[PDB]
Design a protein around this ligand. Structure first.
Ligand SMILES: [Zn+2]
Ligand SMILES: [Zn+2]
Ligand SMILES: [Zn+2]
Ligand SMILES: [Zn+2]
Lengths: 65, 65
């Protein structure tokens, strides 16, 4: 048997975080109070602008529907 | 770049076909007027009962959302 996974590449979008949030790539704070970084619209990964260049494109999540 | 695909295993359900439908595995008609075969709830593959055990479990389709 297998989980069903959605498998593609990240789709990052600039995001306003309402609480202090860290980069899921590098571990440093997403600095500031607005437009602090990017969130993948598919898997929710949060990254700095600079870290968008550094993450693997692979984007997977388990479909729990 | 990558398509987004849903990737899991088939989820076959006994199906009452309304029009003449063929087995996507073996090519023979799904005989009868009711419960003629099984349809995968995820990818739509149609199979005879006997062909359910002959198909690969792999079930993928492109997410066009
Ligand atoms: Zn992602
Ligand atoms: Zn970072
Ligand atoms: Zn399937
Ligand atoms: Zn068949």
């Amino acid at each position: 048997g297998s989980r069903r996974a959605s498998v593609g590449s990240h789709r990052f979008k600039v995001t306003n975080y309402m609480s202090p949030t860290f980069c899921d790539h590098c571990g440093s704070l997403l600095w500031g109070l607005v437009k602090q970084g990017l969130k993948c619209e598919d898997c929710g990964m949060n990254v700095h602008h600079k870290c968008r260049e550094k993450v693997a494109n692979l984007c997977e999540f388990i479909v729990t529907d």
